[PDB]
Structures are given as C-alpha cells and as structure tokens.
Amino acid sequence: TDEEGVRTGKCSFPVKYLGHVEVDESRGMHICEDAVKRLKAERKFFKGFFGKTGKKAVKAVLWVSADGLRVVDEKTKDLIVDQTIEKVSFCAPDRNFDRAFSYICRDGTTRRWICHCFMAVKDTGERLSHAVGCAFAACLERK
Amino acid sequence: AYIGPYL
C-alpha cells in the first residue's frame, strides 16, 4: 500500500504544516513532543492578534519519496519545503498528540538540528512516520 | 521512530 507508493513517488498525505523549530538533539521522542508543544503555544499565544505573525500554520500536501520530503501548499502550490532525505536525522509521531508527526534534520549552514512538525488531517501520525521510514529504508538500502 | 540516514 503506502510502502509501494513511496518507492514509486506516488505516496501522499494531506497535512497542516505547523513549521520548524530548533531542537537540541538529533533524535528523541520527547525532543519531538517538545517541538510540537512550542509551535502549538506560539500559534496559540498569538491568537486574536490581527496581522501577520511570523508563525502561522499552513494547510498543505506532503509528498514522501526516497529522494526527499516535499510539502506543497495546496493553496498556492508553491514548493514550501524540499528536504533531502540524507540530511534527515529522525522522524516520529507524538505520544500525547495522536495526529502529530515531525522529523528532525541537520542544517549544515546554520550547523544546527531542526525539528519540523505537521498535523495530519485524515490520517494518524504513525502512518506518516511509517511512510517516512520507508523513505529512510529505501535510501539506506541501495547506498 | 524511525532513525534517519544522517549521523
């Protein structure tokens, strides 16, 4: 099903891209959890405010292949994130937020670890995490 | 989970 989709570049998930946040470790279930509650408390603290805040959740569609993760805005169809899978450290669902999924990755210019959170609309977080694991696998295996 | 190919 999903697994056959990732290799064939056909695998997609409807999502809400919450945004990125610096995190202090490359892997970790609580590092993720933290990053999710930060973004959810950044969006929430700024509620009611009328204007552009730095950090507003964005409805988009997430594509998962062996080459990278891409999130294309459903609204503008602009490629918002084109992340190569080889500079990806970790990914995970959220123990206390069932719709949540995130992945950590290294950014070599800033020389830092960066979490990237999403909230799935029609699916559970673990289906997504699994899909990205299939990506991880496909990558690791021919190399 | 899972772990990634970086590192």
Author numbering:
A (entry chain A): 27 to 169
B (entry chain H): 1 to 7
Lines from the paper:
Numb functions as an oncosuppressor by inhibiting Notch signaling and stabilizing p53. Numb can also bind to Mdm2, thereby inhibiting its ubiquitin–ligase activity on p53, which physiologically destines the latter to proteasomal degradation. In the four isoforms of Numb, the PTB domain is present as a short version (PTBo in isoform 3 and 4) or a long one (PTBi in isoform 1 and 2), differing for the presence of a stretch of 11 aa coded by Ex3.
We determined the crystallographic structure of Numb-PTBi bound to a phosphopeptide (GPpY) derived from a “canonical” PTB-binding adapter protein at 2.8 Å resolution. In the two crystal forms obtained, the canonical PTB fold was extended by the insertion of the Ex3-encoded sequence. The 11-residue Ex3 loop was found to adopt three conformations, all characterized by extension of helix α2 of one or two turns. The crystal structure of Numb-PTBi showed that the Ex3 sequence connects the α2 helix to the β2 strand of the PTBi module adopting several conformations without altering the hydrophobic core of the domain. In addition, the “canonical” phosphopeptide-binding region of the PTB domain was remote and completely distinct from the Ex3-coded region. Indeed, by a variety of approaches, we were able to show that the peptide-binding cleft of PTBi is not involved in the interaction with Mdm2.
